[PDB]
Amino acid sequence: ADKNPGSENMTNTIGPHDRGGSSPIYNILNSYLTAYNGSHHLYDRMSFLCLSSQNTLNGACPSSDAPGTATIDGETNITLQFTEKRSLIKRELQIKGYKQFLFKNANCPSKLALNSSHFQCNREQASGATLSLYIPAGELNKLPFDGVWNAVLKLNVKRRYDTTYGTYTINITVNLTDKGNIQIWLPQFKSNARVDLNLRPTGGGTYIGRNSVDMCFYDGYSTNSSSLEIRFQDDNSKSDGKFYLKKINDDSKELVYTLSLLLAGKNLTPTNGQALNINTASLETNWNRITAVTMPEISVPVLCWPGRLQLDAKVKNPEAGQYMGNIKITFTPSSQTLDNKQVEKNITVTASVDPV
């Protein structure tokens, strides 16, 4: 229980908190012991000071001993700047601090502002102090984007109006998510996306076809997911791994095409029924205004992974009529603790057979 005050480094990880609900209070320090001695009273008047009362880089709050001799009861307001890891956006949150005194033969657990003057409890001088710091309920709602937010909080630990013992460095990481907004976004299509292969005839009974669909993958998390899983599936069970498009009337009268996908800078060739598991470390990200999946269509800018799906179809010995097939894209961004229900998007595909 004896403890001598000096510099310390700590880390603290909050969340994942989903925006779905108002944020709980999170503890950063709960009556953490900063100094205590059984015999002497050197730690009678512990105080804690911010490096600056104006600069919020490492937390802003009083940075001098309170000049009054009467205590300042209650909590201190610390303004601290958080930085979002992938987008580098900055936003300040409030953190709350206070200290409490320990006395060997009495109890005066009253909360004092961090820079407060000391007091005695039934004429006994304190023998140490504890520190608490928490984030008040609902502060997280003020962060403007989903993702990983970092701050580095710094407090000076000192004997009031006396020697400074050291500095406390607390690295706080907030993980903020919006899972109800995980989605595969089609810039070009409001509710359902359908495209034609644009069939062209050349060089004899042979035919061409090529079109593409643009899309974003959003992980609710400003692309802080470590990897992601994508699949393209069409309901024609076969281990052929191919993509068929059938005529609207008769079964097994079908022509085939392939998919290639440019994903955030990476070339891929998905085959039917085979998930891809892509590491996100190398992918690029773009800002895009997406529509909110769950509430109304209004669109809010997020940081997502751009993609372009290309369809290529060449077939000889196609039959007269008209073709259609559907592509089912499913998407599951990696998860720190629990899985994210796979999201999905369907694309309808059309083909034209041209009799003279």
> How far is residue 244 from each of residues 189, 212, 267, 278, measured CA to CA in Å?
23, 16, 22, 25
Gap between the Cα atoms of 204 and 354, Å rounded: 13
Ordered domains of the chain (ranges, CATH): 1-177 (2.60.40.2520), 178-356 (2.60.40.2040)
Query: What residue has token string 């005529």?
Result: 247
User: Which amino acid is present at 154?
Assistant: K
The Cβ of residue 210 has, within 10 Å, a number of other Cβ atoms equal to 14
Resolution in A: 2.6
Q: Name the residue among 270, 312, 15 with its Cα closest to residue 143.
A: 15
Say how far apart CA 353 and CA 356 lie, in whole Å. 10
Q: What is the 3-state secondary structure (H, E, C) of the chain?
A: CCECCCCEEEEEEEEEEECCCCCCCEEEEEEEEEEECCCCCCCCCEEEEECECCCCCCCECCCCCCCCCCCCECCEEEEEEEEECCCCCEEEEEEEEEEEEECCCCCCCCCECCCCCCCCECCECCCEEEEEEEECCCCHHHCCCCEEEEEEEEEEEEECCCCEEEEEEEEEEEEEECHHHCEEECCCCCCCEEEECCCEECCCCEEECEEEEEEEEECCCCCCCCEEEEEEECCCCCCCCCEEEEECCCCCCEEEEEEEEEECCEEECCCCCCCEEEECCCCCCEEEEEECCCCCCCEEEEEEEEEEEEEECCEECCCCCEEEEEEEEEEEECCCCCCCCCEEEEEEEEEECCCC
Residue 222: which region, alpha, beta or left (left: phi > 0; alpha: psi -120 to 50)? left
DSSP 120: -
Question: Tell me, what DSSP letter sits at residue 298?
Answer: -
**Positive or negative, the Cα torsion across 238, 260, 196, 298?**
positive
Helices (H), the chain: none
Q: Does residue 62 have a cis bond before it (omega within 30 degrees)?
A: no
Specify the amino acid at residue 138.
G
Q: Which of 42, 287, 316 is nearest to 160 (CA)?
A: 42
Q: What is the dihedral of CA 223, 229, 230, 231, to 10 degrees?
A: -170
Gap between the Cα atoms of 154 and 272, Å rounded? 53
Closest C-alpha among 218, 194, 211, 216 to residue 259? 211
Instruction: Give the technique used to solve this structure.
Output: X-ray
* Phi, psi torsion values for 143, nearest 5 degrees: -60, 135
